[PDB]
Design an enzyme around this catalytic site. Structure first.
Site, PDB file in Angstrom:
ATOM      1  N   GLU A  18       0.822  -1.211   0.000  1.00 27.40           N
ATOM      2  CA  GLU A  18       0.000   0.000   0.000  1.00 27.40           C
ATOM      3  C   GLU A  18       0.857   1.262   0.000  1.00 27.40           C
ATOM      4  O   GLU A  18       0.699   2.149   0.840  1.00 27.40           O
ATOM      5  CB  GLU A  18      -1.013   0.008   1.146  1.00 27.40           C
ATOM      6  CG  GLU A  18      -1.821  -1.260   1.248  1.00 27.40           C
ATOM      7  CD  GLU A  18      -2.393  -1.476   2.621  1.00 27.40           C
ATOM      8  OE1 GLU A  18      -3.299  -0.710   3.000  1.00 27.40           O
ATOM      9  OE2 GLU A  18      -1.945  -2.401   3.321  1.00 27.40           O
ATOM     10  N   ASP A  19       1.788   1.322  -0.950  1.00 29.80           N
ATOM     11  CA  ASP A  19       2.703   2.444  -1.142  1.00 29.80           C
ATOM     12  C   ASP A  19       3.661   2.636   0.021  1.00 29.80           C
ATOM     13  O   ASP A  19       4.154   3.738   0.242  1.00 29.80           O
ATOM     14  CB  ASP A  19       1.944   3.745  -1.412  1.00 29.80           C
ATOM     15  CG  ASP A  19       1.319   3.779  -2.781  1.00 29.80           C
ATOM     16  OD1 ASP A  19       1.927   3.232  -3.722  1.00 29.80           O
ATOM     17  OD2 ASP A  19       0.220   4.352  -2.922  1.00 29.80           O
ATOM     18  N   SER A  20       3.933   1.599   0.795  1.00 29.67           N
ATOM     19  CA  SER A  20       5.124   1.611   1.621  1.00 29.67           C
ATOM     20  C   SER A  20       6.311   1.134   0.792  1.00 29.67           C
ATOM     21  O   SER A  20       6.173   0.744  -0.373  1.00 29.67           O
ATOM     22  CB  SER A  20       4.928   0.759   2.868  1.00 29.67           C
ATOM     23  OG  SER A  20       4.213   1.472   3.855  1.00 29.67           O
TER      24      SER A  20
END
Ligand SMILES: [Mg+2]
Ligand SMILES: [Zn+2]
Ligand SMILES: [Zn+2]
Ligand SMILES: [Zn+2]
Lengths: 144, 97, 44, 263, 51, 66, 45, 48, 49
Positions: A18-20
RNA sequence: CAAUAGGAGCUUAC
């Protein structure tokens, strides 16, 4: 305004979802995406009348009231800290006093450091403003 | 603030009752908040800049209210469409396939 | 004579930027202002 | 039963084939050499006069990243286990750097060779910044113009790469096994044919390719490992390998000690 | 010549004092050669006019 | 700013090679060949030297204020 | 008293809180304080 | 998830998320999963 | 000020994902854990702690 | 044991 990092696209350990994004600690240790930060505080002396003006000076407790909760032990005798001095949050970098209108007749108008930031004083400038009153600019430095 | 304290955790906008839920605390370094990845759907959150708010109950009545009404396990099924709102997502789904 | 290639176009574009730069509109507007506009406002 | 076959061996790098060992052993050796082999690096910097354009912590980071000769670092003590106050002579190495540009033309470059060892636990051969040759100029540290000066007192201490990368004796440990995928540990992505689209390993000619008539073997484990250790000059390749082995041995001995003395 | 006021000057324009002074004196005046101008300095603060 | 001492990705020392790289570039050798002779074989190490921008030359041009 | 420096002509001097803010050698208008005398430590990380 | 929620309660259903996440994440860590420019490319006949 | 208002004992920071946390767990930074507080009445079961 | 207000502007995540 950037750096060429080596990037893998993988579901490696699940910490990049999740966009980490996972970054190499060793590459950070060798200087990847390391940056300098400079903050400059400003202050000057105002003229409230004929002989009523402010002064840059280390405010002694006896003649002054409402002193800030930070430490004043870093100011030189001119009310200015010197470049090269480590500074923490809430520490005073420009001591200033405003006279009490008509002993123990002075209040302080000192500029503390921001409660969040650490760093090292870099460049304490001193000049005069448009009206010939003393003028001070203090540039701090830190690394993020 | 200590481990297992119930705290209300919240992301704006709070469009439905499952956008603000009570979580158990685990203390960690590294100044971000940590979330299990299956609860990011009811919050509509992701990890590209988002910030979320944490509210600490200051009494026992509010601790009990949080833990017995707002707790994350109690909101898995929603009354909006009588279906679950938390699922398996985003890498566990691909990996389980 | 030969066919103009893409690199020829980038040479032309480099000429354009060598002349004008990136903020030439601001500078030219202000130069026009101080050359003519102030005097015209005084003579309005 | 374990066997070593060195293929290339110079001072900075050693290329060797490891065989008859488990993959966990080979990977533990790779990890140990990357992360847990002690070296010497500047861990404390003292600025006297720095009027160069570069900032103080910029220069401090660069000085900390300078490789130093660490051959005898194992006979030295960690600065957290010494009774001494502010650094003594036996758990630290003190360096000096003095540089200055005189004149009003040209630029004076400040190199790592200009670092001078002043004290240190003699006669141990530690502390000196590593030079490639007799004529090496070392690492670029700063540049100086007219009247700009740099006066620095660096302290060097013993540490490992877990705490910070500047203590890493190694740059890149190349590591591979089973060039022909006989064990089927990988599963090749392809468009038309996986044999044409994938380059051969540099140790492909070291092992027999599978025969077309051959069937899959479910008894074969990985048994030969080709790895190329490189160093930064702080330690030599054979020294890095041997001290990685020794560090792993002492880690296992520590575990054994705790187990036995837990009874 | 009655003094009627002071007009702020756009940096790097024909009336700026940096318009001349090729790179050497720009360096001596503490000005970055990459700085393109196009803005004003009011009370020591750079201001840009949005079209 | 100034050439980094180590390669970010793997840690090879590249800080002692910037001057040699510039000298290789003066006699006409193209960047890949110069990087080959300096024995930078991994593309991480290669992009360390190939993408460096030396800004200290620009910073040093403003007169020292002391 | 405490050491200062010019911003234009790099002159070193020391002023004592009652003269105006000025340089001796040239007479320039802006001055910078000098670096402290204490000793500063960095972690080299 | 709905079935476990309805039969076992909220606590067991909550622990199901963690069990599945941990097992699948370990397997994918040691298997691996990626995506590249080649995963968007179709062969010549499909292009035709 | 009446339908909504600013409140004490709140915190805010960027969120991150953690595969190793339970569903009803939130990871709290140490600095926030020390800045925020909970008032716990002293009783004969928690006096040592 | 005490750290102003009001505005405008630029931004963050939906
Ligand atoms: Mg977001
Ligand atoms: Zn000691
Ligand atoms: Zn590299
Ligand atoms: Zn002067």
């Amino acid at each position: 305004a950037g750096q060429n990092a080596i990037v893998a696209i993988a579901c490696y350990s699940g910490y990049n979802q999740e966009d980490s994004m996972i970054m190499n600690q060793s590459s950070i240790d060798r200087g990847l995406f390391r940056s300098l930060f400079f903050r400059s505080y400003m202050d000057q002396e105002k003229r409230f009348g004929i002989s009523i003006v402010e002064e840059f000076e280390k405010p002694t407790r006896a003649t002054t009231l409402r002193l800030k909760h930070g430490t004043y032990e870093k100011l030189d005798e001119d009310g200015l800290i010197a470049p090269g001095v480590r500074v923490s949050g809430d520490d005073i970098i420009i001591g200033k006093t405003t006279p009490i209108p008509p002993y123990h007749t002075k209040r302080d108008a000192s500029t503390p450091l921001r409660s969040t930031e650490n760093g090292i004083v870099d460049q304490v400038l001193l000049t005069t403003n448009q009206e010939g009153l003393k003028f001070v600019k203090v540039r701090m430095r830190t690394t993020k | 603030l200590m481990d297992d304290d119930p705290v209300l955790f919240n992301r704006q906008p709070s469009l439905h009752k499952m956008s603000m839920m009570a979580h158990r605390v685990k203390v960690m370094p590294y100044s971000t908040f940590r979330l299990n990845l299956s609860v990011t759907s009811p919050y509509n959150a992701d990890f590209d800049g988002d910030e979320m708010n944490l509210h600490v109950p200051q009494s026992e009545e509010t601790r009990a209210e949080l833990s017995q009404l707002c707790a994350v396990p109690l909101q898995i099924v929603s009354p909006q469409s009588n279906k679950p709102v938390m699922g398996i997502v985003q890498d566990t789904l691909c990996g389980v396939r | 004579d030969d066919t103009i290639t893409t690199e020829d176009c980038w040479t032309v574009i480099s000429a354009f930027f060598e002349e004008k730069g990136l903020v030439s509109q601001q500078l030219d507007s202000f130069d026009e202002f101080m050359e003519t506009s102030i005097q015209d406002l005084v003579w309005e | 039963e374990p066997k070593v076959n060195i293929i290339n061996a110079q001072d900075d790098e050693v290329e060797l084939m490891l065989s008859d060992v488990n993959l966990s052993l080979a990977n533990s050796l790779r990890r140990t050499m990357l992360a847990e082999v002690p070296t010497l690096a500047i861990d404390l910097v003292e600025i006297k006069m720095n009027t160069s354009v570069l900032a103080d912590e910029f220069i401090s980071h660069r000085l900390g990243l300078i490789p130093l000769v660490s051959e005898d670092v194992e006979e030295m003590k960690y600065s957290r286990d010494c009774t001494c106050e502010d650094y003594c002579d036996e758990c630290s190495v003190v360096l000096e750097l003095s540089a200055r540009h005189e004149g009003e033309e040209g630029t004076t470059d400040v190199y790592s060779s200009s670092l001078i060892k002043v004290s240190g636990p003699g006669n141990l051969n530690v502390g000196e910044p590593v030079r490639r040759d007799d004529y090496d100029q070392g690492i670029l540290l700063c540049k100086l113009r007219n009247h700009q000066e740099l006066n620095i007192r660096c302290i060097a201490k013993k540490g490992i790469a877990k705490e910070h990368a500047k203590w890493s004796p190694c740059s890149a440990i190349a590591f591979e096994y089973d060039p022909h995928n006989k064990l089927k540990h990988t599963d090749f992505w392809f468009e038309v044919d996986a044999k044409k689209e994938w380059p051969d390993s540099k140790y492909a000619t070291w092992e027999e390719p599978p025969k077309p008539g051959e069937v899959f073997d479910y008894k074969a484990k990985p048994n030969r490992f080709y790895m190329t250790v490189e160093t930064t000059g702080s330690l030599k390749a054979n020294q890095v390998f041997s001290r990685g082995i020794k560090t792993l041995q002492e880690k296992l001995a520590n575990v054994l000690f705790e187990l036995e003395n837990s009874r | 010549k009655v003094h009627i006021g002071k007009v702020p000057i756009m940096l790097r324009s024909k009336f700026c004092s940096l318009r001349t002074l090729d790179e050497v004196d720009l360096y001596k005046m503490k000005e970055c050669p990459y700085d393109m101008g196009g803005y004003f300095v009011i009370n020591g603060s750079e201001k840009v006019l949005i079209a | 700013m100034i050439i980094p001492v180590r390669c970010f990705s793997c840690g090879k020392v590249v800080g002692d090679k910037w001057d040699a790289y510039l000298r290789l570039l003066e006699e006409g050798k193209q960047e890949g060949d110069a990087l080959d002779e300096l024995k930078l074989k991994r593309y991480c190490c290669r992009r360390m030297v190939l993408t460096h921008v030396d800004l200290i030359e620009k910073f040093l041009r403003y007169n020292p204020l002391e | 008293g405490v050491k200062y420096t010019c911003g234009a002509c790099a002159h070193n001097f020391s002023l004592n809180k009652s003269d105006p803010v000025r340089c001796k050698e040239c007479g320039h208008r802006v001055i910078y304080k000098a670096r402290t005398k204490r000793m500063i430590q960095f972690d080299a990380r | 998830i709905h079935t476990v929620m309805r039969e076992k309660g909220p606590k067991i259903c909550a622990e199901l998320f963690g069990n599945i996440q941990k097992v699948v994440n370990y397997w994918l860590l040691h298997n691996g999963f990626s995506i590249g420019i080649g995963d968007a490319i179709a062969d010549a006949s499909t292009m035709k | 000020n009446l339908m909504g208002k600013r409140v004490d004992f709140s915190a805010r920071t960027v969120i991150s994902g953690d595969p190793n946390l339970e569903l009803d767990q939130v990871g709290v930074p140490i600095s926030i854990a020390k800045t925020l507080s909970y008032p716990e009445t002293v009783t004969q079961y928690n006096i040592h702690r």
